[model samples]
Target: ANDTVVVGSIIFTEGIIVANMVAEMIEAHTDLKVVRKLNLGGYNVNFEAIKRGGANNGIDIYVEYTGHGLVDILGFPATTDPEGAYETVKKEYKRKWNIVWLKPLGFNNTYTLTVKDELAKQYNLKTFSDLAKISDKLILGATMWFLEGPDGYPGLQKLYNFKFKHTKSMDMGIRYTAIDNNEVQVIDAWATDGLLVSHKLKILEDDKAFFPPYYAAPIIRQDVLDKHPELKDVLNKLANQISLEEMQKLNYKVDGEGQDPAKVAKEFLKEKGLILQV
Candidate 1:
């Protein structure tokens, strides 16, 4: 008899990477089985997965970002402080879903406009406000969400007065390519994405602080914990231990260089001395 864990996430590179990592971690150390499910459309699907699980569906744990969970998952306004947001969501999830959230690793692979290394160096751009001064000379690419959403670039523009001569909506994946090729001087990139290192693109400092924290963590059902309290310690340690630099390297192996997620994760564990080398 196998215990199944129903996991959910989007189809994007980051989403797939994270969901796979969590599943791999659980399967490596526990008797519980994983029911791999991907591309559940969007954040709402993941929320629904938790709701359907409702203590009995065998869908135990899932990954979420602090910012998205705050606005889209928990339907709260954007917040800058990652810790405060984590506490807020933890309390709400425990109260509403009877779920227990583990400690969040100190990383936020969230949205920000990025520029080519040459241009960044030329302009001495250290922040969003700095980029704003020369925004008119650059071509920008971003997702539709960033164009119209309340928490998107429009909000940033309004708040910071950052203006760009040309802006276009493109597929998220293409944005990376655009920034790398110089087709677009600046494009939206995640802070901890593997591509940042892979493409050698420079992330412009959001001097104006337009974006919110997007910390990552595991959200587990309470019943899952009741059966295996040890999971709490194992996962909590894993969560609190991995840092942004570590995550970026792991992601680079998987995304930048195209290594297998499991292979990358195992190497990571071994390198971190979390698992004994045999």
Candidate 2:
């Protein structure tokens, strides 16, 4: 029986977590096997996997974020509404490579600006507007990618008339480290990333709400669905099961507690009652 679902994704923590969770959910409830866990190194590599997967029919399911899929993948600008963004990407993926997008989970995982809790409390910084008052005094750190990316901080600075005393362009890993160590007061981070909790970083309220939404969802090959229609129902059950807080806890278990992602994924599914006890 051809009961296998080939999966490919990046090696990042978030990617690994989502892919494993989805794979576990499908495997536990159905006869589908998650085969060939291809670890693409970075964003570009993962995108290329999708293209190759489409051509060779090698990969059956993968995970993607709405903001990345829209602006980075399909070249659409950031959008606020999840449904609209989902429909747009769904159409583009289907039209471009015959891939189908499953339902998006409720949480968003996009680039967010974070400040120290003490700094936020000290300055009574409740929103971006609050930060603007003291933007000139704060030192900021972010990945070089965010500095130059289209939906990066430069656009936010220009739009909001805020400036920083110092801006350091570093690797994302380093940025998080620097922020945690107080080397930099402000940093760019992901909304639903586990590091936020692990490092105790406070995500600044987006008073201006300038950043785009990034809901996570499973992107699968159409052929997989043709073979196993029940896969859709299994994935759809996970759409609203996980929230931002829940994602953070799961991430902490992996990044902070050093727990395995597969174990964490199973625990999450079991807690949500997605997987029934046999």
Candidate 3:
């Protein structure tokens, strides 16, 4: 019937890498031609496209995270239990949106609070609670996603009942740089952001469990799988392939070392023998 599969991704640099990996792997394993709608504005944009179907500017599949679902989408109260969160999102998404959450990529890119080495050492900050003491003097940096989310800053303020002197919203990609230069003493970071590892920075523990699980998983429309039945199995082959450490390395190569995301995805897939070298 010549129906092309429409795929999508969000705007993060790692987003492109994961999306390309999914697209390339599907093409290698199946006869489907995928049209990648990569770096589509943000989570809200991509999730809307995935729901609307391929008839319009919608998509058949894209990567999503469990915690994102719990807070941002389903509005369920957040949880620290990764599997419980994933199971809830997987079931609820299927029930509410008719979406299929493929097995997780074995990584949780959940939000983590990171501080500069100096701040960490000076305050002896080991957890989110420690921020309560020094936060009044510090500035907080983050992307708009965290600022606007009901379960992000709003929830954080409620749980810890603390606030910083100032809040700066910038591109998610540059939050780390803002911390490194002391532009802000604290910033929101993804668990797998490469800068945390490369710069030898410290990520504070969320001992209060303010956020939910955010394990990465690809979600597809039920109808898309119905159209190409074999795709169900093909997609599952990628289940749990990437660990947090592996994802950080992949991201580090792209963001820190200036390697192309496509090249990085290709090399990682090849190394895992997910696709035969052509």
TM-scores of all models? 0.84, 0.84, 0.95
lDDT, ranked from best to worst: 3, 2, 1
In order, the Cα lDDT scores of the candidates are 0.73, 0.76, 0.83
Model 1 per-residue lDDT tens digits across residues 150-190: 55676678777867889988886678888777778888787
Order the numbered candidates by TM-score, best leading.
3, 1, 2
Per-residue lDDT of 1-278 in model 3, one digit per residue for the tens?
57689888877877889989888888898888889886445546777888897767788988888888877555645676888888888888899999999988889887777887778998899999998667899999998877877667878877887679999997876878888888888888888887777665788898888888788888899988888887888878789999999999999998889999989998999999998886
| CA error at residue 114 for candidate 3, angstroms | 0.7
Count steric clashes of candidate 2: 0
Question: Which ranges in model 2 have alpha carbons more than 4 Å from their true place?
Answer: 36-38, 41-44, 54-58, 73-76, 129-136, 144-149, 161-165, 169-174, 198-200, 276-278
lDDT of 2 by residue, 107-215 (tens): 8877777898888888887777788789899988987756876667766888778789998987756777898788898988877667787676677777776776778
Model 3 scores a TM of 0.95
Q: Pick the candidate with the highest TM-score.
A: 3
Candidate that would win on lDDT: 3
Question: Between which residue pairs do clashes occur in model 3?
Answer: none
How well does candidate 3 score on lDDT at residue 31?
Answer: 88
Report residue 24 deviation for candidate 3 (angstroms). 0.6
